[PDB]
Amino acid sequence: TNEAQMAAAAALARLEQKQSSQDTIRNQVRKELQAEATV
Amino acid sequence: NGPEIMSKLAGESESNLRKAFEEAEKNAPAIIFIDELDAIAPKREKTHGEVERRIVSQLLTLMDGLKQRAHVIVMAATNRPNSIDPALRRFGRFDREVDIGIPDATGRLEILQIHTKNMKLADDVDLEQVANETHGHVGADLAALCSEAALQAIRKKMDLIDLEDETIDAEVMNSLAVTMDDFRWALSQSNPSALRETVVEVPQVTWEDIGGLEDVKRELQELVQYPVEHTPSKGVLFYGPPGCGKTLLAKAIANECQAN
Ligand SMILES: Nc1ncnc2c1ncn2[C@@H]1O[C@H](COP(=O)(O)OP(=O)(O)O)[C@@H](O)[C@H]1O
């Protein structure tokens, strides 16, 4: 039913958050940006 | 301490060792200090006696018991980390260690100033010069140095004062000063205990002591500055003709950085 469908959306969202290229590339650039900012 | 437990007979020895640990729990928070760790727990593979091997095992179990003996910390003193049974140094037990080393020229002066807190010094006494010359001396050597200088000063005056009673007059002690002749005499009798050991300290050689090499000095400053402002380099090789100051360059950069 619809109450289970809302539980389905929550279970799938947590699975995707646990599984998670874009954040690895952005984080690697962020680290290099801070080093170039202070050097 | 080792000798206190090892002097005991089988059974009494292990009993006294574990009893002290039980007392620490009862009086927690508490610190258990085990002196001469290499004497209480020598390497098992280096002994033949059953008593020594059992004592090592008993200490190992007592260290593990610290999971229940809340707020009890056990400290131990040894001469070398490699003079004790390696089991003690495994995760847990004694998994933290600190190298005390030998006091440097500044520390030796501070130690002398501590020992002379109760001592009246004459105007000719220069403890900084003494601290610079007393290479190879540790705090217990400087304690003996001050004691010997004190006794020499006492003898010189008491032979003439002739105060023979149960108590000493505060006035004649308060006027007694220890001079440079009394420290010099004591220095000639003192014998350093750490003369053969390596002493590590901040050097006193600075850039003004090195002639020329203006570009080398700047390059060395960049080496130590870049790892802080920003793989940074952690070393440099000096090569070229002999007698140009290779050692002085290494000391001068340590000096300015306040590094050992
Ligand atoms: N650039 C320099 N400026 C002044 N004195 C120097 C210089 N290079 C060498 N010396 C003299 O040579 C001696 C030996 O220097 P040192 O660096 O101890 O030799 P090494 O590095 O080969 O052990 C020093 O006592 C110093 O007086």
Short overview:
This is part of a larger assembly, with chains A (39 residues) and B (260 residues). Chain A is mainly alpha-helical and 39 residues long. Chain A is built from two helices and no strands.
Written overview of the protein:
This is part of a larger assembly, with chains A (39 residues) and B (260 residues). Chain A has 39 residues and is mainly α. Helix content of chain A is 90%, strand content 0%. Chain A is built from two helices and no strands. By secondary structure, chain B is mostly helical. Chain B has a domain of 95 residues: Orthogonal Bundle (Helicase, Ruva Protein, domain 3), CATH 1.10.8. The two termini of chain B are 33 Å apart. In chain B, 17% of the residues are buried. The complex binds adenosine-5'-diphosphate (ADP). The site of adenosine-5'-diphosphate (ADP) has 11 residues of chain B, from helix 11. Chain A: It comes from Homo sapiens (Human). Chain A: It is found in: Cytoplasm; Cytoplasm, Cytosol; Membrane; Nucleus. Chain A: This is UBX domain-containing protein 6.
Please give a handful of descriptors for the protein shown.
part of a larger assembly, 2 chains, A: 39 residues, mainly alpha, 90% helix, 0% strand, B: 260 residues, Helicase, Ruva Protein, domain 3, two-stranded parallel sheet, 11 helices, flat, binds adenosine-5'-diphosphate
Task: Describe the protein's topology.
The structure is cut from a larger assembly and holds chains A (39 residues) and B (260 residues).
Chain A: H1 2-19, H2 22-38
Chain B: H1 2-6, H2 12-26, E1 30-34, H3 37-40, H4 50-64, E2 72-76, H5 105-115, H6 127-133, H7 139-161, H8 170-174, H9 180-189, H10 214-229, H11 246-256
Parallel strand pairs in B: 1-2
Helix pairs in contact in B: 2-4, 5-6, 5-7, 7-9
The structure holds adenosine-5'-diphosphate.
PDB class: chaperone, hydrolase
Keywords: AAA+, chaperone, hydrolase
Entry title: Cryo-EM structure of p97:UBXD1 lariat mutant
